């Protein structure tokens, strides 16, 4: 049982040790393409690169590289694309990926500016009347509407392939109060957000994988995906207590390095899954409780 595992770790003061063990056991795969000199301006951080085996390839002959990885969770039957916050010169690549991968939703867990420093480009329009055109990939992006809540914002965007003239509605789920290398204000606020993404239909297998990002696409991003996949497994398995969150995280790390960046983020992931499980195990009244507890504007 996760509650028992959580207490065992918490009471012994072993979070740093458990987390460091996961880091030590994590997969080590090559990232040769990410390191090619010509790709230097496509990486936000020198210490965060996608593995070659799981990287997302752009469908262009020029240069198919983007710092993004496909996290394919076989048993959970869900895939996610984790990517860095787009750079000024990779915003067109980012939307090209969204288009090509048939994604319906984009989950952003960081702010454009954090601690007086730029952590992600302003890759979507802030005003309806000021749409964006990405010349390099021939895509147009328009803000259709946005619903701003106390700690997160949901936006409806229209993405158009200017080559084929076809358009698609993309849902943007922006968590605006999650500090870098920090944790959500509470399991409640996090789960309320996660279930909003779920209820939107964006994570449905009928769509391409949801695109999840933070500044590097590994810390807050890994937390989001780890919680979601664990809950998926608990709903799917005969014995939900058989889900080992540490093993799920190691499985995810076979696809992208460094998922979950701090011991406290790992600790928070346990709390988020333990709380979310109360809903999966029936008692769907907790969902309204998180809603109320989140104080979403």
């Amino acid at each position: 049982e996760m509650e028992k595992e959580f207490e065992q770790i918490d009471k012994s003061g072993s979070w740093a040790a458990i987390y460091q063990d996961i880091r030590h056991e994590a997969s080590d795969f090559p990232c040769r393409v990410a390191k090619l000199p010509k790709n230097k301006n496509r990486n936000r951080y020198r210490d965060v690169s996608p593995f070659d085996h799981s990287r997302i390839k752009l469908h262009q002959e020029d240069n198919d590289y983007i710092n993004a990885s496909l996290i394919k969770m076989e048993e959970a039957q869900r895939s996610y694309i984790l990517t860095q916050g787009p750079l000024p010169n990779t915003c067109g690549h980012f939307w090209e990926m969204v288009w090509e991968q048939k994604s319906r939703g984009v989950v952003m867990l960081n702010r454009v500016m954090e601690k007086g420093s730029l952590k992600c480009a302003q890759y979507w329009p802030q005003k309806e009347e000021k749409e964006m055109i990405f010349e390099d990939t021939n895509l147009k992006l328009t803000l259709i509407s946005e619903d701003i809540k106390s700690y997160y914002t949901v936006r409806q965007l229209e993405l158009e392939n200017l080559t084929t003239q076809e358009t698609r509605e993309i849902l943007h789920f922006h968590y605006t109060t999650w500090p870098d290398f920090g944790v959500p204000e509470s399991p409640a606020s996090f789960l309320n957000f996660l279930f909003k993404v779920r209820e939107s239909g964006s994570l449905s297998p009928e769509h391409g994988p949801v695109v999840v990002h933070s500044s590097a696409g590994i810390g807050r991003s890994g937390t989001f995906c780890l919680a979601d996949t664990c809950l998926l497994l608990m709903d799917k398995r005969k014995d939900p207590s058989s889900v080992d969150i540490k093993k799920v995280l190691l499985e995810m790390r076979k696809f992208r390095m460094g998922l979950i960046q701090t011991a406290d983020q790992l600790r928070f992931s346990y709390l988020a899954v333990i709380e979310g499980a109360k809903f999966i195990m029936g008692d769907s009244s907790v969902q309204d409780q998180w809603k109320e507890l989140s104080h979403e504007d």
Binding site: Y45, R46, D47, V48, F181, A216, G258, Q261
Partner: peptide
């Protein structure tokens, strides 16, 4: 060079 992680 820009780094995401802490090495201090």
């Amino acid at each position: 060079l820009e780094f995401y992680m802490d090495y201090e």
